[PDB]
Amino acid sequence: LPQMTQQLNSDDMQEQLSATVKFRQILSREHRPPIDVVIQAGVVPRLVEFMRENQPEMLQLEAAWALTNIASGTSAQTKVVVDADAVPLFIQLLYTGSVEVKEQAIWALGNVAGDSTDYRDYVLQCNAMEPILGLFNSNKPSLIRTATWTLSNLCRGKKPQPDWSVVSQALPTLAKLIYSMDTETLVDACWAISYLSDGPQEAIQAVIDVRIPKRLVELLSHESTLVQTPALRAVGNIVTGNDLQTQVVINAGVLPALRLLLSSPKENIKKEACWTISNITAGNTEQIQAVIDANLIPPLVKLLEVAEYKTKKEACWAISNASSGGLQRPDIIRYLVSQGCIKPLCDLLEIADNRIIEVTLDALENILKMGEADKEARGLNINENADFIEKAGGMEKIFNCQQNENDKIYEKAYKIIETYFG
Amino acid sequence: LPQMTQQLNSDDMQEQLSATVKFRQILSREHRPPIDVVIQAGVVPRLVEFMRENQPEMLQLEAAWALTNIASGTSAQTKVVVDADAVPLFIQLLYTGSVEVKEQAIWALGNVAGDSTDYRDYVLQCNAMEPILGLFNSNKPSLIRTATWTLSNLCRGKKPQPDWSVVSQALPTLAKLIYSMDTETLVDACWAISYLSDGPQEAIQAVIDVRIPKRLVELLSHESTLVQTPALRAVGNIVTGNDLQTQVVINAGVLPALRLLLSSPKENIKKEACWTISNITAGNTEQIQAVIDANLIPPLVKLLEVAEYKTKKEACWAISNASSGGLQRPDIIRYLVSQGCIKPLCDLLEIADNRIIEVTLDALENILKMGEADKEARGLNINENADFIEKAGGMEKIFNCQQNENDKIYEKAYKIIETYFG
Ligand SMILES: [Co+2]
Ligand SMILES: [Co+2]
Numbered sequence A, B: 001l002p003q004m005t006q007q008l009n010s011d012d013m014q015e016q017l018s019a020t021v022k023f024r025q026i027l028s029r030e031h032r033p034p035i036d037v038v039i040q041a042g043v044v045p046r047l048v049e050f051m052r053e054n055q056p057e058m059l060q061l062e063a064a065w066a067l068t069n070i071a072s073g074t075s076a077q078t079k080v081v082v083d084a085d086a087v088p089l090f091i092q093l094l095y096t097g098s099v100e101v102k103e104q105a106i107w108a109l110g111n112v113a114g115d116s117t118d119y120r121d122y123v124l125q126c127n128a129m130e131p132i133l134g135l136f137n138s139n140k141p142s143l144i145r146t147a148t149w150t151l152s153n154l155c156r157g158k159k160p161q162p163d164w165s166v167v168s169q170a171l172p173t174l175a176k177l178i179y180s181m182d183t184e185t186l187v188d189a190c191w192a193i194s195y196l197s198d199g200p201q202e203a204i205q206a207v208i209d210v211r212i213p214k215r216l217v218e219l220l221s222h223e224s225t226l227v228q229t230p231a232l233r234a235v236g237n238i239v240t241g242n243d244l245q246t247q248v249v250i251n252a253g254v255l256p257a258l259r260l261l262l263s264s265p266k267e268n269i270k271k272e273a274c275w276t277i278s279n280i281t282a283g284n285t286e287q288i289q290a291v292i293d294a295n296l297i298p299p300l301v302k303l304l305e306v307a308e309y310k311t312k313k314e315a316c317w318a319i320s321n322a323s324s325g326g327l328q329r330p331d332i333i334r335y336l337v338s339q340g341c342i343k344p345l346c347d348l349l350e351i352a353d354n355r356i357i358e359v360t361l362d363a364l365e366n367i368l369k370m371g372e373a374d375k376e377a378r379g380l381n382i383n384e385n386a387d388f389i390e391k392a393g394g395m396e397k398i399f400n401c402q403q404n405e406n407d408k409i410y411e412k413a414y415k416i417i418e419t420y421f422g
Helices: A002-008 A013-026 A035-040 A044-049 A057-071 A075-083 A087-096 A099-113 A117-125 A129-137 A141-155 A164-177 A183-196 A201-209 A213-221 A225-238 A243-251 A254-261 A267-281 A285-293 A297-306 A309-324 A330-338 A342-349 A354-376 A384-391 A394-403 A407-420 B002-008 B013-026 B035-040 B044-049 B057-071 B075-082 B087-096 B099-115 B117-125 B129-137 B141-155 B164-177 B183-196 B201-209 B213-219 B225-238 B243-251 B254-261 B267-281 B285-293 B297-306 B309-324 B330-338 B342-351 B354-377 B384-392 B394-403 B407-420
Strands: none
Touching (some): A013 A057, A035 A057, A035 A075, A044 A057, A044 A075, A057 A075, A057 A087, A057 A099, A075 A099, A087 A099, A087 A129, A129 A141, A129 A164, A164 A183, A183 A201, A183 A213, A183 A225, A213 A225, A213 A243, A213 A254, A225 A243, A243 A285, A267 A285, A267 A297, A285 A309, A285 A330, A297 A309, A297 A342, A309 A342, A309 A354, A330 A354, A342 A354, A342 A394, A354 A394, A354 A407, A384 A394, B002 B013, B013 B057, B044 B057, B044 B075, B057 B075, B057 B099, B075 B117, B087 B099, B087 B129, B099 B129, B099 B141, B117 B164, B129 B141, B129 B164, B141 B183, B164 B183, B164 B201, B183 B201, B201 B243, B213 B225, B213 B243, B225 B254, B243 B254, B254 B267, B267 B285, B267 B297, B267 B309, B285 B330, B297 B309, B309 B330, B309 B342, B309 B354, B330 B354, B342 B354, B342 B394, B384 B394
């Protein structure tokens, strides 16, 4: 190392190149590259020098390669490279460099961007977006992957949400990347899109205008859960928007697609599928009816019954939001009850957290108001739904809620028992 | 009714009495007392007239009785009585009335008070507390029961919390009632105390000052779970207070008692027991060491693995809080690991909601930091805990968390994987 460090500091171009190649090779070890000793040798800032505008490209590639092996190490190791002010140089190399040079720069920039939110912003402010977006006009798959990966690292994060004026510039490229033949590329593009869709209406509408929604919906039935997961996450973030934005996703045909995801052997997919659906049933009466017409209630009721809690929780919201539209269209409630949602709802009370008990009690109450409403509409002397709940053992569970510490809950419980089971 | 209404409005005493008796009788029907028909009759204000100070006591009783049957009906019916100015007369009857009159008055007041926080405050504001506490100097079980139940309704409610200057006057009486032989009385007294115990530091301190804690602890081993629940709830509320207030409960011997409750056939007792413990391990080092010395970790680790989620969740907090104390005394962490908390903690990650995942990742990161420090203090070239976690399958689960939408979680995950599994 002392010997190499010498060559590197030599003024002989040929000797500098000889040294950088060496530092690049040791930093390329698959085992445990002596990154820390290299940093301890103080040759980082020198290697950074070799990436300057007028250095020979071979020297630039070797130096960037070496620095990239370092920047892709631990966070500490990344800080060193960043502090040597390598980022601005990696970025100009994105414009100038050969494919090989570009592959190192984009990788290194991706690691800096994915290190933390402050580095994410640093990179964005160094204006990496322009040169990064130009990489997609190339035809090398591997280079496009890294680039897409780095792009997702720039879009990710919600405490400091990334500078939207900058990151939104990626939407057009992203809209094309989700048609990629490369699976890894597809995956990261969908993750990036989900990150951009994890924001206000402005963000969501932006994703809608570049016509990404329909492609996202087609990707829900991709053979791989690695593609399905981020695609669903993105769809889920989009339907969190307003009713108009959600209808866009619905006209793209997301409902029939969701029907398949509810059967996914992947628990988190069933979970986010129920989550997505609950943000659609949280919409207007016509959107709730659409969920009904797509035959999404039956599988939902089933999950409410057998899935893990984290999924049941989601199924409940979906069903409870659906029952909210029952005040208007009473037949929605009638349909929910027909699909056997009462038993699952009652049982849930026994294992749910307080927020879910509130949600579940809302659904049960809406169900009771309905059964009460057409009980009067007829000369009947019984509230069928109330009777339904009693049989399912729900009465006893609602009674038990009277001892819950939460005011909203126990008060909701007393009112229910008193009103329908007195 | 038309005839009774007439007699009721008569100036003839013997007539008013006879008619009040008849209204009382029909409003006493076990079946479905015609309360609404009686209200429609418009005689409520008239009956209220009959409870005034100058009225013959028999008329006072029959009128109060009649109105109490109405007041103990639906909220809407209770409202009719409250709006007729009955409350202040029920209260003055609580002083002057015979035992029979008092029994009606206290049942009416309890129903008004339990209706809502508005009626609760109105009742407290009408100075009902003075004659109510005065009923405890009586020697009739049934009366003391209803009186205790009423006191419970008056102390309940946390959104508007009840006027502390008023409800706190019940502590001395409450401190004595928890030594009662009557189960119902004891139950209600314990509930009333748990409600008083859910306030700020002052409320908790007043409960400690009148020396209720030790009795609460003794009651944790009461044969009936109807007594243990509210007693455990009250104890739980007290330990949410500061470290000093928490030591009072510890010195009362709560730990051995909780150890027993961790095997309660009641899921919610196991749950609040874990919750109670978690609020003790959230204290200083000595308090965490006390939990350890009482042998609470093993049963805690067992629940973390096999209990319902709502309980596991509580066990996780208890164990996780304990590990935070590991920084100071590294042997706390070593002990936790020795009791096999790692495996159940990793598995929890697969089914936990985001807040619990965060709690779990902190526990795991503390354990992991400990295994790292010792590997250093020793020449070991392995982080035993990291290896335990990897063996348990928690490595992959932690890895998966990197795709969680929550920033604090995925950052935590990437940080862990990079730092201990690289
Ligand atoms: Co990194
Ligand atoms: Co009531």
